[PDB]
Every structure is written in C-alpha cells, then in structure tokens.
Design a protein around this nucleic acid. Structure first.
Ligand SMILES: [Mg+2]
Ligand SMILES: [Mg+2]
Ligand SMILES: [Mg+2]
Ligand SMILES: [Mg+2]
Ligand SMILES: [Mg+2]
Ligand SMILES: [Mg+2]
Ligand SMILES: [Mg+2]
Ligand SMILES: [Mg+2]
Ligand SMILES: [Mg+2]
Ligand SMILES: [Mg+2]
Ligand SMILES: [Mg+2]
Ligand SMILES: [Mg+2]
Ligand SMILES: [Mg+2]
Ligand SMILES: [Mg+2]
Ligand SMILES: [Mg+2]
Ligand SMILES: [Mg+2]
Ligand SMILES: [Mg+2]
Ligand SMILES: [Zn+2]
Lengths: 217, 129, 25, 87, 32, 208, 60, 96, 124, 97
RNA sequence: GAAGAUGAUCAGAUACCGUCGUAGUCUUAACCAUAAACUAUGCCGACUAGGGAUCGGUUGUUGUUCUUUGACGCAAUCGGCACCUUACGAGAAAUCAAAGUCUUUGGGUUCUGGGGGGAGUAUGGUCGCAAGGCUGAAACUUAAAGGAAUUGACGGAAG
C-alpha cells in the first residue's frame, strides 16, 4: 500500500498532468515504474505463455531456477512482453509481468484495401527477428482471423489486431525468440514510413519540460 | 563486368538513403536510369537530380529526402501479362494502398497503377516504396 | 579408428580383392 | 491514416528525425529533443520560446549529429559560416 | 515433480490455515 | 539571425589563444574536419576558433532553454577541469559532476545520487565516456567540448577547443558561465565586465 | 541380435487379470442429447475449485 | 548473385540442375527407383499374406528387457521370408 | 590481525554522518555516547564501534575522509577554494602586451577582422 | 572452432615457408610459426667477471658477449615455459613484455 | 632415414628414446595427379567507415646526412601483403570491411550439399607399369549423429 514515485515521469503521472500512454510515446520517454502503466491502462489482461526450468551446474550438482514468459496487452493497440528469471515460478511470473508492462509499445492498426470502419489489420508488411526465428506479419482482408500459431496468435490478439496473415522461419519451437521477434515486428509499424505519414509534424515540448516543478523533488 | 547499370544506380541510392545521406553519385547513367529516377521523382520518393555530361556514359547526383524505404531492380526483366500484375504487386509491395511496381511497356516506363489505367503491360523493371 | 588408417586398411583390402578376382579372369 | 468518414483513426502520429527524416520510434531512447532559446535585440534570452530539433538515435550513433546541427542551425540562422556544404 | 507443479496450490492450501487459526483463536477466547 | 554584439570580440579571441584553446590534437577524426583551419608544422592542428565561438554561443542558447537550472549537469573527470565545473555550478545553479561518475546514476533508480538531467554537458568525450553513454539511454542531449581526437558519437553540440590543456578547460567554462548569465539578464549587457576572473575555474595543485 | 527365448510366458498378465463384470449402468444418451449433456456440465453448473477446473477429478 | 543463373534464357539449366538435385531426396529416390517394387518384402503393397513358419520371440533392446513374441512368415506372393510381430498380451497362442 | 569487520565499519561511519557535532577525539567519552545513541547488543561491539569511530574522527581532523559526508566539511569548502591572484596570468600583461602566437595561427587571426599585435614564434 | 585468426603463424600472401629444426627437440617447424627470441648475453657469469679481469694480462680488456638466435617448436617452447597460456582476450596482445 | 637389425624401457612392447642402417632423399629422361593442395571462404562488377603503418609507381615540397648523385623527411594519390577501431549491417555463436547492401527476399556467372551410418564400399567404365586416380550405387541399419557457446568436473598445462 502507498506508491511513492521515484522518477520525474512517475510524478507527472501521479498528478493528472499525463493521462494517456501516447504522450509517453510521442517523446520516447523511458518507463521505469509499472504504476505508470497501471494508471494509464487500468484494464489490462495478462497471460503466462510459457514456463521453463533452467539449471546451473555447480560443484555438487545442478541449481535449478524458473523462467517465466508473460504477454500483456489491452486489445486496443498496446501490447507488452516480459521474461524474468527467479527461484520460484510465482515470483518469476509476477516480476515478468512488471517488465512486460515497462516494455509496452503502441502498434499501428491499418486497413487491408478499403478504409471502411475502424482499422482491422496491419498497414504494411512487417518482420521481426530474434535468434534464428523470423516472424512475418502480412496485412489480411477482413475475413481471415489471426492465421498464426497459438503462440503468435495470442500476442496478436492482446495487441488488438483482428486480421493478419503470418509466416515464420527458423526454429519456431524456441518460444522466447518467436515472441521477441513478433514483438519487434509488431512494433515496426510505427517505424515504417508510409505516404500518409510523410507530412512533417512540429516538435511539441516534452511533458517533462512543461511540468518541471511537479517533477522536481 | 558491369551487367546492369540500373542495378548499380539503385544500389547506390539504397545505400545512401539507409545511411541517412541526402545525396548520391551514380555511374554510369543511361536513359533507363534517368527514366527510372523520373518515375521515382514524380511520386516524391527522391528530389531533384542532376545529369553531368563527361562525353561518356555520364554521371548523376540525386537528392534524397529520407522517404524511400526501398527501390530495386528485377533481374531479369521478366515478361509480365496484365493478369500477372496482381500477383507481382502482392509479392513486392508492402500494402495494397501504396507502393508501385515499375514496368517498361511499349507505351513507356510507368508504375503498375498507371499501367492499369492505360491497359498496357511490358517487362517488369523494378519497384519502389 | 583413425580416418587415415581406416583408408589404409581398405586400400590393402581392396588390394586383396583385386588379386582375388584375377584368378577367374 | 484516417478512415472513410475522415476521422483520424490513427493514434500517436510519431515524430521524425530532423536530419534524416527517419521516424523516431517510441522506444528509441538514444533520440533527443534539442531546445534552443530565442534571443532579443538586447542580447537577452526570450523566456519560453524555442527553436526545436529532434535527432534519431541512428544519427547520433554515427557521430553525424554534430555536423548535422551545424548544417541545420546554419540554414535557420542560428549559426554563421561554421558548416560548409562543399568539402 | 519437474514443473513447479502445484508449487502455489500448496501455499493456497497453506492459507486456509492462517484464516483458520485466527478464526479458531478468535472463537473460544470470545467465549472463554 | 543574431545581433552583431554577439560576434567574436577581439578581447575574447586574445583569451582563447593565450589559454591555448586553439591547439587541437595532432590527429583529427573525420567528424571534426570542419573545425580544422590548417595544420601547424610541428604537427598540431589549428582550431578555427571562430567556429569555436559560435558553438559556444549556440551551446549557451541550448542551456538557457532548460527550465530547471539544477536539471543541467556539467561534467569533468580530468583533474584540470574539476575546479571549473564546481564553480560553474555555483554561478549558474547547475549540478556539477566532478571526478568519478558512478555507473548506473542515470539508469538505476535506486542509487543514491540518481539524477534525471534534461541536459548533460561534457568536458572531454574521451575521459567522460561513461556519462555520455548513459545519456543515450534516457533521452538526454549531450553538449561536449571536443578536441580533434575526441569522439563525436552521441554528441549533438561539439565545442572545438583544447581538452588537454590546463588553461584551455577553465576559459571555455568561464566563458559559458558569463554568456549563460548574460542571457538570463544577470549581466546587464554584453559589455559589462564580469566580477569573476578566468583564473577562478583553474585547477590548483596541493601546493598553492 | 541374439534372438530366441522361452515362449511359455505368453499372455501372463492378461490371463491372470481378475475378471470384473461391467455394472449394468444406465445407457448414456445418444446423438443430439449427448452434446446437450456435455454443454451444461462445462458451462452451466461450473464445478471449478477457485480457478482449478478438472473434467475428471479423482477423489482426493 | 546467389550462385545460380538468373537470365531469362537459362531455363534449361535451372530445370536440369533441379532434376539432378532431387536425387538427393531419398523419398524421391525410392519413388523413381521403385525400391519398394524391387527390394521391399511386400513389393509395394500395403498388406501381404503368408504362412507361419515358427514361433520364436525377440529380445528387446536396452534399457528395456523383454521377449517380443513374433513369428517367421514366408510370403505367398513371392516366397520371401520376414519376421512379423504378434501384438497384444498372449496372441502368440492364437498363432500356430 | 586487528582488521575490524563490516558490521563495525559501516555502523561507525553512520554515526559520524549523523552525530558529528556531539563526537570527540577521546575514546572514553565516545564510548559513553554510543551507549545512548545506538542499540548495541554486546559490550564488545560497543567498544569496537567507538574505537573505530574515534580513529575516523582523528582522521577527519587531518583532512577529508572517504565515505563520510555530513553538513559542514563541504559547505566550508565551496568558498574555501576562492583563491585568485591579482594578475590574471592570462591577462596580456606577463608578455610585452601582445600575443606570442605562432605565425601559422596568426594567419587565422588575420583572416578574422581583428588587429591584435603579435610577435610570431616559429618552433619549426 | 578456429582458435586464432593468424593460425599460430605469420603467413599472409604466401604459399609455403621452409622449415627449421627446434633447438630443443629437433622438430621441423615453419619459420613464420616459430617462437623467436633475440638474446644478447654476457659470455662470463657475473661471479667470475672480477677474478678474470685481475688475471687478465691486458689492462682494460672488454669481455665479448655471446650472440645467439634460438628457434623453438610449439611443444618445446610451451614445455620450457618460453611462452605461456594466456586468456582469450590477453592472447591478442603482441607487444613485447 | 621408411623397411630391417639392434641397446634400453615395460607386465608385454615390433614403438616413443639410443646405435647401425636398405630404398628414398639429390640429379637427368619419363610417369603419377594426390595433400588440413587452407583463407577449410569461386570469379567479375558497383556501393557502404574511419585510422596508423608498409611494398611498388607517379606528382607537389625539407631545422636532415652525403657525392665532391643518392639517402632521409612531409603530403597527395592509384594498386597491392596485411593490420587497428566501430558495428550502419549480418550471424546460432565463435566471429566478419565482408561472412554487409538478404521476407524491405532478383547485378552476371561456374561448382557443390539434402539426417547419421553402411561408404568413397561393391559393380561397370576409363586413366595408370604399379601403387593407385577419376566416375560411383544398393540392400540393410539407426533416433539421433553434429556446430558454436555456457556452467561445472577433470588435466602428468601456466600464473
Ligand atoms: Mg535473479
Ligand atoms: Mg526502420
Ligand atoms: Mg493492403
Ligand atoms: Mg497496388
Ligand atoms: Mg545504446
Ligand atoms: Mg538412410
Ligand atoms: Mg575493520
Ligand atoms: Mg580445440
Ligand atoms: Mg600472390
Ligand atoms: Mg601450401
Ligand atoms: Mg627478435
Ligand atoms: Mg625396426
Ligand atoms: Mg601430366
Ligand atoms: Mg564457401
Ligand atoms: Mg513468404
Ligand atoms: Mg559392401
Ligand atoms: Mg563443441
Ligand atoms: Zn621442439
């Protein structure tokens, strides 16, 4: 009980100065307090995608630890992914959720073909790589759901994507690399310059600049 | 040896744009190179470019504006029928709403969207987006 | 066994095979 | 990006690098936002009134940010005869 | 066991004991 | 543009050459090439101090844009520059970082001296490498005093000067403090003589 | 592989398994009725043990 | 340039080289050599009839230890001799 | 050896950062003070803490100690290092009244609109 | 895997280097690969440099040095501690000690 | 110095070590055509990044020594043998200025591989005086074999 922010960003979120995560993203501000994500995205649902047991050989024998993989998202364009190791699974899952929240990125939903209704798919073909695993996301028409393996399908669902084709290459059974590659891929949508984004936008002042006194100390 | 001067031109453009440079030197020039750049310039993917006469094949200096994701050639210049253009645009372009496949048709060099408008087809030459 | 000596064993045994077939030439 | 009815269905129109025009991603933490004060005719800094430039972490990573600011500021009049177009 | 298997189920099984002991000590005493 | 009162005056130019500011390292990297005027026959490279002055004026204008003066961090790991940054912080209200920079001061939020500066200013990219690296993790712009061998990676504003001079370091810091205060209006105009002497900001040996 | 061996022990376990007759249990419903039975058992009267849901819980 | 010809008139080289290289697929080799037809005891058939020659029994591999109870069968269609396992607890007593 | 441990080294230096005005250079006086300042479980640790605290106090009077930061050593130091000579050693009065820059640097000076007297020096 | 980028020798832009015999074990070793030490040692041990000068019939006669170039193969040199096993990162250091 | 013989060592030692020693080693005419024949990395062309050295050539220029020209020094450049830093970029990693410009997938072109064994075996052909070279299967068997790196353990390796 009782959260005391330790960062400038946390203080600005503790006061009603910053009310959405898109203000965080506009200035690429680093997030270090999970309470920021809880306040701005109150309705988050998590899912423990995989649990693995890793062992470290010692002089007498193995010292076993538990590795947890957690996927977080709001099903409306924001998604995160966390992997953390601890002695116990319950503490590992709880801590993996925290760092999954800290890494939450926005995604661009777009239209396959006509722009009728709300965006339902990706705006362009994207690809991500981690290890040997390469995950490719292709925009899909409104009928096909998530054409992906159950591991990749869950990441897409929590991000709010309705319509997408998928193709993966490499050792997809390495679950951590597959999710990390897809997380990088889904985040590249806000890295791909499209002609509708060609317009130059003015650089607004950072929220850390306009509210300097509330973040002082 | 030098088997495709358009590939050399686009390779120089790709390497300069990815490294953030706003200008690139291309050698040698050609009519196809100039017309490929003109199509790119018409859609805003490059800026002004300059042809330098050296009493030889020539050189070109192109101004880059950072909007270019990728331009490339298709070697060889495959023959493309009109019913095959849909398959080519699906494979090469990032989406159905932007990007262009450049063709050389007997009606001239043009993007696949202009090619659909004038109902012509030729050999595939490259792409840009 | 060593790859070099395995080859020598087979070369000497191929040598034997060649000599054995020549009987019925 | 906007839908058929014209509503801006896009959330978070991102910033772009002033030097290379690349999109500055939401987690590009090597990217910075330079704020430069305006100066009145008395030699005094004008309060809360700035020229702003943004650089992606890529430009800063190549070590070209310094020469890019020399060019970018000189075109905006913030500098004189420090950056040369022709080398 | 390979997996953490029931790891916490053992703890959630552990927890009715504290609520049962606070409640057990809260009764007799009330009527002691 | 800029009023002519902001031009390099002859007085400041005398200070810069007497403090050996114009002496740049023998070997120059490609990114510092615009700042070299000509190479001196011994091997030293002559710094175009006209460019040095404008970067100083440009740097002071960026410093003046930070709202909280304590949010500006001035750093120096070289012993020749340690005295300069402590006095600069006192005069301007900035936060000085002299000597060792504790790794994790910008990224680890449970450390003792955990800061969130809006701007980091560096005396030398070579000897202050640790401070510059962490700034590229938390979106901190970097202003650096650069010699001809100083790296320019993750350096936005480079001040061409002599980083390896006992007198060179103090003068550039003294000049910034005077100009930063001039913009704030503390100094009435660009002609009033400052009470502080450039001798202050200079390193003193334990002898004295 | 050396292959041989006495064949006298063929069928040992199945022969010595004690025969148990099936209790004459009520027939289970067939066709559309059986799909109806499974649906209620899994989504109408949920028997979950506070997030622990088992189709065939052994008595424990 | 990826080490293979790309020219528009090099289709024969691509077709022949691929034809040469599918021989590295053993599944493909067995289909064209007709190895099931020539070497397989069934001759490519799914099933085959035979006459029981003897009840014998095969010792299992490590780390397992058991007597796998099989029979020796001579196929009617071609006279070839194979060993066939007799599944389930005690079905060897059904085979004479 | 007589190497003090960490439970006594860090606990003693917390006292200096917290109770420097009340401390002193005498162990006997220091020994009595820590019995009312800290809760020490054993007598032997109380003398050990005071014996190293006294040593640190004896070391602070000889100069600044590492690891102890309080509130009067540094406040006195900011204006302690104010020494400045009457002549600037950078003022052009040590020389004849003009710069001694090398002739190559003088060309840069000539390029700018400045007329400053110079005695060119050619080290070569 | 590949342990050293130089393959333990000094052969680049060359096909073959003629061998030399190790001083210690007489193993044939290529000249670029051999561990080479230049030694300039005094011909007389420091204990005997005084009495030999007094017994000398020449006033102020300088004792000659003993010049020798030693060639070792890899097994002899490692065995004789001429070179030692270094860490993976310390192997790259090739300045003289 | 293969072979062979011999003195030692060892439980045994045909060997390591020691002593003799024939082919061979060298050369002339012919054969052979194989090597971890290695950069385990095809060739041609373009581009992408900095630095200090060096070899060959050319062009501008010295507080240096020398005949009585030549040497050295400083800059540019083309080409090389290499080397150092970084990683825009690649990779499973070790690592790579190419092993980069590869789902944002197409510069030209030659050769090779398709789980591990059986196997470079049998057979046919062909070259060779021979040893052998080149071409080259199948039956059958098998759930792994293998690459890089990590922790530990061990080592008649170093500190
Ligand atoms: Mg841990
Ligand atoms: Mg990108
Ligand atoms: Mg589409
Ligand atoms: Mg289209
Ligand atoms: Mg970084
Ligand atoms: Mg097989
Ligand atoms: Mg102690
Ligand atoms: Mg090895
Ligand atoms: Mg050669
Ligand atoms: Mg060789
Ligand atoms: Mg030597
Ligand atoms: Mg013998
Ligand atoms: Mg021949
Ligand atoms: Mg190869
Ligand atoms: Mg595909
Ligand atoms: Mg065989
Ligand atoms: Mg291995
Ligand atoms: Zn040897």
């Amino acid at each position: 009980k009782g959260w005391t922010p330790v960062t400038k960003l946390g203080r600005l979120v503790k006061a009603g100065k910053i009310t959405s995560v898109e203000q965080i993203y506009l200035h690429s501000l680093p997030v270090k307090e999970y309470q920021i994500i809880d306040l701005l995205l109150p309705d988050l649902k998590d899912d423990v995608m995989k649990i693995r047991s890793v062992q470290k050989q010692t002089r007498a024998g193995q010292r076993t630890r538990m590795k947890a993989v957690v996927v977080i998202g709001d099903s409306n364009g924001h998604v995160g992914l966390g992997i953390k190791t601890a002695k116990e699974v319950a503490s590992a899952i709880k801590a993996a959720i925290v760092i999954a929240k800290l890494s939450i990125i926005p995604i661009r939903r777009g239209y396959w073909g006509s722009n009728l209704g709300q965006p339902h798919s990706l705006p362009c073909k994207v690809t991500g790589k981690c290890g040997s695993v390469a995950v490719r996301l292709i925009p899909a028409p409104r009928g096909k759901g998530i054409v992906a393996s159950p591991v990749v399908k869950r990441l897409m669902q929590l991000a709010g994507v309705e319509d997408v084709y998928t193709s993966s290459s490499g050792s997809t059974r390495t679950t951590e690399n597959t999710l990390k590659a897809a997380f990088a891929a889904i985040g590249n949508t806000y890295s791909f310059l499209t002609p509708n984004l060609w317009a130059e936008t003015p650089l607004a002042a950072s929220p850390l600049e306009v509210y300097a006194e509330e973040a002082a100390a | 040896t030098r088997t495709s001067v358009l590939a050399d031109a686009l390779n120089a453009i790709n390497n300069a744009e990815k490294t953030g440079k706003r200008q690139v030197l291309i050698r040698p020039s050609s009519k196809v190179i100039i017309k490929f750049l003109t199509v790119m310039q018409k859609h805003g993917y490059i800026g002004e470019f300059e042809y330098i006469d050296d009493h030889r094949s020539g050189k070109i200096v192109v101004q880059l504006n950072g909007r270019l994701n990728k331009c490339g050639v298709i070697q060889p210049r495959f023959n493309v029928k009109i019913n095959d253009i849909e398959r080519w645009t699906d494979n090469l372009l990032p989406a159905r709403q932007f990007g262009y496949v450049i063709l050389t048709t007997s009606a001239g060099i043009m993007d696949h969207e202009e090619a659909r408008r004038k109902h012509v087809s030729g050999k595939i030459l490259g792409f840009v987006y | 066994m060593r790859d070099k000596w395995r080859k020598k064993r087979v070369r000497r045994l191929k040598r034997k095979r060649r000599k054995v077939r020549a009987r019925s030439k | 990006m906007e839908n058929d009815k014209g509503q801006l269905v896009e959330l978070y129109v991102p910033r772009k690098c002033s030097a290379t025009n690349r999109i500055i991603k939401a987690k590009d933490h090597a990217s910075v936002q330079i704020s430069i004060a305006k100066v009145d005719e008395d030699g005094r800094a004008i309060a809360g009134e700035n020229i702003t430039y943004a650089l992606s972490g890529y430009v800063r990573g190549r070590g070209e940010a310094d020469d890019s600011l020399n060019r970018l500021a000189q075109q905006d009049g913030l500098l004189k005869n420090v950056w040369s177009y022709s080398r | 066991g390979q997996s953490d298997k029931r790891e916490l189920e053992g703890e959630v099984e552990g927890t009715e004991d504290a609520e049962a002991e606070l409640e057990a000590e809260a009764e007799e005493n009330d009527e002691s | 543009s800029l009023p002519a009162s902001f031009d390099l005056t002859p007085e400041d130019a005398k200070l810069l050459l007497a403090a050996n500011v114009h002496l740049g390292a023998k070997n120059v990297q490609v990114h510092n090439k615009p700042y070299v005027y000509k190479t001196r026959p011994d091997g030293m490279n002559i710094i175009n101090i006209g460019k040095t002055w404008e970067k100083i004026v440009l740097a002071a204008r960026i410093i003046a844009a930070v709202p909280n003066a304590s949010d500006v961090a001035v750093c120096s790991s070289r012993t020749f520059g340690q005295r300069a940054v402590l006095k600069f912080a006192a005069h301007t209200g900035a936060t000085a970082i002299a000597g060792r920079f504790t790794p994790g001061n910008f990224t680890n939020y449970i450390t003792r001296s955990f800061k969130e500066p809006r701007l980091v200013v560096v005396t030398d990219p070579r000897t202050d490498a640790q401070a510059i690296k962490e700034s590229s993790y938390v979106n901190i712009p970097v202003i650096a005093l650069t010699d001809m061998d100083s790296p320019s990676e993750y350096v936005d504003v480079a001040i061409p000067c002599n980083n390896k001079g006992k007198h060179s370091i103090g003068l550039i810091w003294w000049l910034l403090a005077r100009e930063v205060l001039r913009l704030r209006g503390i100094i009435p105009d660009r002609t009033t003589e400052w009470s502080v002497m450039p001798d202050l900001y200079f390193y003193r040996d334990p002898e004295e | 592989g050396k292959v041989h061996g006495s064949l006298a022990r063929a069928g040992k376990v199945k022969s010595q398994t004690p025969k148990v007759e099936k209790q004459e249990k009520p027939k289970k419903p067939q066709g559309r009725a059986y799909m109806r039975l499974l649906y209620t058992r899994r989504f109408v009267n949920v028997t979950l043990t506070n997030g622990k849901r088992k189709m065939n819980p052994s008595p424990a | 340039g990826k080490g293979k010809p790309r020219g528009l008139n090099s289709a024969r080289k691509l077709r022949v080289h691929r034809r040469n290289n599918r021989w590295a697929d053993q599944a493909y080799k067995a289909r064209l050599l007709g190895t099931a037809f020539k070497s397989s005891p069934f001759g490519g058939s799914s099933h085959a009839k035979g006459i029981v020659l003897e009840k014998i029994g095969i010792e299992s591999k490590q780390p397992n230890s058991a007597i796998r109870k099989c029979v020796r069968v001579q196929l009617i269609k071609n006279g070839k001799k194979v060993t066939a396992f007799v599944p389930n607890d005690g079905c060897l007593n059904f085979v004479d | 050896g007589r190497v003090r441990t960490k439970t006594v080294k860090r606990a003693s230096k917390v006292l200096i950062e917290r109770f420097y005005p009340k401390l002193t250079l005498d162990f006997e006086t220091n020994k009595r003070l820590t019995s009312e300042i800290a809760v020490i479980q054993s007598k032997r640790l109380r003398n050990k803490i005071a014996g190293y605290t006294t040593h640190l106090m004896k070391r602070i009077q000889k100069g600044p100690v590492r690891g102890i930061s309080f509130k009067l050593q540094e406040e006195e130091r900011e204006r302690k290092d104010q020494y400045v000579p009457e002549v600037s050693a950078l003022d052009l009065s040590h020389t004849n009244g003009q710069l001694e820059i090398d002739a190559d640097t003088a060309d840069l000076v000539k390029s700018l609109g400045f007329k400053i007297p110079v005695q060119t020096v050619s080290i070569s | 895997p590949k342990k050293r980028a130089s393959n333990g020798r000094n052969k680049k832009g060359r096909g073959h280097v003629k061998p030399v015999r190790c001083l210690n074990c007489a193993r044939c070793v290529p000249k670029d690969k051999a561990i080479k030490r230049v030694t300039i040692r005094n011909m007389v041990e420091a204990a005997a440099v005084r009495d030999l000068s007094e017994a000398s019939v020449y006033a102020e006669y300088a004792l000659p040095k003993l010049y020798n170039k030693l060639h070792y193969c890899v097994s002899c040199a490692i065995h004789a501690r001429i070179v030692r096993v270094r860490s993976r990162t310390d192997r790259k250091i090739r300045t003289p000690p």
